[PDB]
Design a protein around this motif. Structure first.
Motif, PDB file in Angstrom:
ATOM      1  N   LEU A 277      63.801  63.753  24.621  1.00 19.87           N
ATOM      2  CA  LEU A 277      64.674  62.737  25.192  1.00 19.87           C
ATOM      3  C   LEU A 277      64.235  61.361  24.713  1.00 19.87           C
ATOM      4  CD1 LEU A 277      64.939  64.151  28.809  1.00 19.87           C
ATOM      5  CD2 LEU A 277      66.512  64.470  26.904  1.00 19.87           C
ATOM      6  N   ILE A 278      65.177  60.595  24.163  1.00 17.99           N
ATOM      7  CA  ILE A 278      64.846  59.264  23.664  1.00 17.99           C
ATOM      8  C   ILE A 278      64.482  58.341  24.817  1.00 17.99           C
ATOM      9  CG2 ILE A 278      67.188  58.328  23.689  1.00 17.99           C
ATOM     10  CD1 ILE A 278      66.396  57.250  20.780  1.00 17.99           C
ATOM     11  N   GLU A 279      65.024  58.613  26.006  1.00 19.65           N
ATOM     12  CA  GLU A 279      64.639  57.852  27.186  1.00 19.65           C
ATOM     13  C   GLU A 279      63.167  58.043  27.506  1.00 19.65           C
ATOM     14  OE1 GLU A 279      66.477  55.743  28.756  1.00 19.65           O
ATOM     15  OE2 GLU A 279      68.293  56.118  27.579  1.00 19.65           O
ATOM     16  N   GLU A 280      62.667  59.272  27.380  1.00 16.79           N
ATOM     17  CA  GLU A 280      61.269  59.524  27.700  1.00 16.79           C
ATOM     18  C   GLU A 280      60.343  58.852  26.698  1.00 16.79           C
ATOM     19  OE1 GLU A 280      60.292  61.050  30.400  1.00 16.79           O
ATOM     20  OE2 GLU A 280      62.198  61.861  31.122  1.00 16.79           O
TER      21      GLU A 280
ATOM     22  N   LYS B 140      61.101  56.120  25.033  1.00 16.43           N
ATOM     23  CA  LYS B 140      61.187  54.704  25.371  1.00 16.43           C
ATOM     24  C   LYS B 140      60.300  54.370  26.560  1.00 16.43           C
ATOM     25  CE  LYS B 140      65.637  53.854  23.819  1.00 16.43           C
ATOM     26  NZ  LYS B 140      67.075  53.788  24.194  1.00 16.43           N
ATOM     27  N   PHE B 141      60.302  55.224  27.585  1.00 19.30           N
ATOM     28  CA  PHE B 141      59.459  54.986  28.750  1.00 19.30           C
ATOM     29  C   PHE B 141      57.983  55.073  28.386  1.00 19.30           C
ATOM     30  CE2 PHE B 141      57.273  56.922  32.500  1.00 19.30           C
ATOM     31  CZ  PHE B 141      57.187  55.757  33.223  1.00 19.30           C
TER      32      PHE B 141
ATOM     33  N   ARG C   4      57.140  51.861  26.583  1.00 22.05           N
ATOM     34  CA  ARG C   4      57.189  50.715  27.482  1.00 22.05           C
ATOM     35  C   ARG C   4      56.045  50.733  28.486  1.00 22.05           C
ATOM     36  NH1 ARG C   4      56.566  47.511  30.329  1.00 22.05           N
ATOM     37  NH2 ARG C   4      57.848  45.814  31.171  1.00 22.05           N
ATOM     38  N   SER C   5      55.504  51.914  28.793  1.00 17.25           N
ATOM     39  CA  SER C   5      54.421  52.001  29.765  1.00 17.25           C
ATOM     40  C   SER C   5      53.156  51.308  29.285  1.00 17.25           C
ATOM     41  CB  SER C   5      54.125  53.463  30.091  1.00 17.25           C
ATOM     42  OG  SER C   5      55.276  54.108  30.600  1.00 17.25           O
TER      43      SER C   5
ATOM     44  N   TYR D 164      65.192  48.468  20.209  1.00 15.04           N
ATOM     45  CA  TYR D 164      65.839  49.490  19.398  1.00 15.04           C
ATOM     46  C   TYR D 164      64.837  50.589  19.090  1.00 15.04           C
ATOM     47  CZ  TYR D 164      69.626  46.168  18.730  1.00 15.04           C
ATOM     48  OH  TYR D 164      70.663  45.290  18.933  1.00 15.04           O
TER      49      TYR D 164
ATOM     50  N   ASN E  87      69.292  61.996  21.825  1.00 17.84           N
ATOM     51  CA  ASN E  87      68.345  63.077  22.049  1.00 17.84           C
ATOM     52  C   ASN E  87      68.406  64.069  20.897  1.00 17.84           C
ATOM     53  OD1 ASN E  87      67.756  61.935  24.583  1.00 17.84           O
ATOM     54  ND2 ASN E  87      69.413  63.097  25.549  1.00 17.84           N
TER      55      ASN E  87
END
Lengths: 190, 382, 113, 95
Positions: free
Chosen positions: B320-323, B325-326, B329-330, B338, B347
């Motif tokens: 998952l690209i969200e994961e 990114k998270f 970012r963490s 981007y 994904n």
């Protein structure tokens, strides 16, 4: 005040040996009545001592005596559907000796089922159905395959159709073969 | 129920009660309870012999329990193990015949307190300049557990013998065992269980393969690895080696040799190497100038190394690209603008159930509020 | 336990399981420390008077006996003093470990280091 | 019961140098095991001693190490955008 070793193992009179004797002429050991009266109790105590000495042997299924097999069966996890008084004592010894090390540890495996069947003196062959049998199948055209959750127990012709061995092996297979597996007891065609 | 008590609480009370019984039986005619009486020495001697008998009965019940543990359960009771080591004898010449070091050869340390004896006969063959044999300590206890090369003194010289040493440290030396340790060791035997589900099937394989490796267990998946063709009684194992690469045939064979005696009747165990999908990342993020560019790059790199660690990845699951990114970012000191995964911003689904992700390349493009741009390309392949 | 004299034997500190030699090490530790040597306890230790005439040469013997009695309760101590020729005062400490009833020999003594 | 100066600065063995020595032959200094066992602790204590000695230096921005510039920032009143962690270390010192 004798040491226990002399009274129990050398004299084997744990009570009479402890009776006063120092004052010769008149002592308990000077009168044969003291020996006679304590004889039975010494004998009973020595018998109980010998039983206690042999007791650790009685918790070894191989070497122990047959009276303790049914007593040890609950300790090894054997009960009414699995255990049976009809089992020959040699089979009882074999089954109890290998309960924790082989049987309950790996229940459901081919080795455990075959071991249980051999313990009850049932000659057998566990055969997984398949399209290729090493004995007779020919290399050029016969194909490889397997059955999946299927197997069979093949017995020699010495046993009678639905006799003692057939129904005993049916019971053992029900108790030890995996429940989801389809099995059948058949005559060994070899 | 409760454990019965084998010993008598008070034996003087027993003597007294046998003398009260001498009165009861005779109907109040035997009323002498003192040592000068006729019955008292007999009753006291019986009580003492009975105390010895009951002490032996207690010992016998304990020993019977221990014998049940040793024979049935298979757990020996440790009353002290004599430490053992591996002695090496080095000769000073290449003898034309066999050099025989007889059994029970005594060697010791410098102090002379510790003494080991060879357990067997050492037969150094002709033309061999050294030979090894196991030795055992003279007594039980932890004091005999010493490191290597401390057991070298021998008082009895042999011709052509140059040195005697212990290559191994002496180990397995214990003085006994408490009852709690024996009980837990017995209970561990009952807990022994064969793998029956996917999870414990994977854990058994990963334990053999080693730390840093992964496995995946799929039911009814045949050799051809076709999902639409289910094959009854089949458990396919897909292994990723200790280094993150798909398992080589040696690993496949050593896992099979370990798991074969554990499958039950009517089950076919298949073992195959797992698959890896390479993940290439390009990142454009805005720094907040709370860190340097190099610190940000290193922290993001470590965070992504942790995120794509095989243990943290479930094979056959989409990345998952969200994961990602998270995870980036963490780190904290940046703000992602981007992110492209394998030249896409969506994904990434996996082709099959037995493919694990492995990220191999990241392109850093970092910017601060000042407009300074930090560009880098990190290839993370081994 | 680690007996008093720190010796590295077989690569580790000499750890003993016999309390008699541990008590002997305690006696050696008490006799080897002069009152004031330790910063944590500057009152622990035997009192030493070296350069003085031999007139009240039993008082220090009695003090050492008392100190050994208070410090080490697992043993019984009797301290005797003798006068030698040049300047030597010979102290003899007779101690017995109350745990045992016979004299206990130690195998580390015969070992040569 | 010796002084601190000797044990920490001359001997640099603040623990071992304090072990009793008077009874020659049977004393802590007569056995090398005593020296070996306490060596690490003396080393650690002396390292911390030197760190504490240089500590007053570390609060001078010109002389301190770069690890303390970000620690001294709020002390001097730099927390909001005025301060940045991407600033050059020399510029941080001067500010």
């Amino acid at each position: 005040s004798k040491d226990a070793f002399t009274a129990w193992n050398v004299d084997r009179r744990p009570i009479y040996s402890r009776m006063p004797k120092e004052q010769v002429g008149t002592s308990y050991h000077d009168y044969i009545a003291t020996d006679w009266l304590t004889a039975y109790w010494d004998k009973i105590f020595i018998e109980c001592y010998d039983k206690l000495e042999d007791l650790p042997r009685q918790f070894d299924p191989l070497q122990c005596d047959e009276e303790y097999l049914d007593f040890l069966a609950p300790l090894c996890g054997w009960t009414a559907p699995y255990w049976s008084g009809d089992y020959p004592p040699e089979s009882k010894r074999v089954l109890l000796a290998n309960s924790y090390s082989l049987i309950w540890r790996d229940k459901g495996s081919l080795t455990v089922l075959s071991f249980v069947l051999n313990a009850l003196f049932i000659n057998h062959r566990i055969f997984v159905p398949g399209s290729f049998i090493l004995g007779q199948s020919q290399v050029s055209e016969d194909t490889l395959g397997a059955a999946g959750w299927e197997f069979e127990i093949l017995l020699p012709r010495d046993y009678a159709e639905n006799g003692y061995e057939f129904r005993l092996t049916l019971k053992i297979a029900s108790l030890f073969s995996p429940l989801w597996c389809k099995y059948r007891v058949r005559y060994d065609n070899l | 129920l409760n454990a019965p008590q084998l010993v008598v609480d008070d034996y003087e009370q027993l003597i007294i009660d046998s003398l009260v019984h001498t009165n009861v039986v005779s109907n109040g005619e035997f009323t002498d309870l003192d040592a000068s009486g006729f019955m008292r020495p007999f009753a006291g001697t019986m009580a003492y012999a009975g105390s010895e008998l009951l002490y032996k009965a207690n010992l016998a019940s304990i020993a019977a329990a221990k014998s049940f543990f040793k024979n049935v359960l298979g757990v020996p009771e440790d009353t002290g193990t004599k430490a053992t080591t591996t002695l090496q004898f080095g000769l000073s010449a290449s003898l034309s015949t066999d050099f025989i070091v007889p059994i029970n050869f005594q060697v010791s340390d410098l102090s002379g307190t510790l003494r080991f004896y060879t357990i067997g006969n050492l037969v150094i063959p002709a033309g061999a300049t050294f030979g090894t044999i196991e030795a055992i300590a003279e007594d039980i206890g932890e004091k005999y557990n010493v490191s290597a090369n401390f057991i070298d003194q021998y008082s009895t010289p042999l011709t052509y013998l140059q040195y005697v040493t212990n290559i191994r440290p002496a180990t397995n030396g214990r003085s006994g065992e408490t009852i709690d340790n024996l009980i837990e060791r017995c209970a561990q035997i009952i807990r022994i269980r064969n793998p029956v589900s996917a999870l414990d099937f994977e854990q058994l394989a990963e334990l053999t393969m080693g730390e840093g490796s992964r496995c995946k267990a799929i039911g009814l998946l045949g050799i051809n690895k076709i999902v639409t063709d289910p094959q009854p009684g089949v458990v396919h194992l897909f292994l990723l080696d200790v280094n993150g690469n798909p398992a080589d045939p040696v690993t496949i064979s050593t896992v099979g040799a370990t798991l074969q005696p554990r499958i039950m009747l009517g089950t076919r165990l298949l073992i195959s190497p797992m698959e890896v999908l390479n993940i290439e990342l390009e990142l454009i993020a805005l720094s907040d100038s709370s860190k340097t560019f190099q610190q940000l790059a290193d922290d993001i790199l470590e965070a992504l190394k942790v995120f794509f660690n095989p243990a943290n990845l479930t094979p056959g699951e989409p990345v998952l690209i969200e994961e990602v990114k998270f995870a980036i970012r963490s780190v904290g000191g940046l703000s992602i603008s981007y992110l492209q995964m394998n030249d896409n911003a969506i994904n990434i689904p996996m082709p099959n159930q037995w493919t694990i992700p492995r990220f191999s390349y990241i392109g850093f493009e970092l910017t601060d509020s000042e407009g300074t741009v930090y560009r880098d390309n990190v290839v993370t392949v081994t | 336990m680690y007996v008093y004299p720190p010796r590295i034997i077989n690569g580790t500190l000499y750890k003993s399981t016999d309390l008699a030699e541990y008590t002997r090490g305690k006696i050696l530790q008490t006799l080897s420390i002069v009152r004031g040597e330790l910063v944590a306890d500057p009152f622990f230790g035997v009192p030493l008077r070296l350069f003085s005439n031999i007139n009240d040469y039993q008082s220090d013997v009695s003090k050492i006996q008392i100190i050994l009695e208070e410090e080490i309760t697992e043993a019984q101590f009797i301290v005797t003093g003798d006068l030698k020729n040049n300047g030597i005062v010979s102290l003899t400490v007779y101690w017995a470990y109350l745990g045992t009833e016979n004299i206990e020999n130690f195998e580390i003594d015969t070992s040569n280091i």
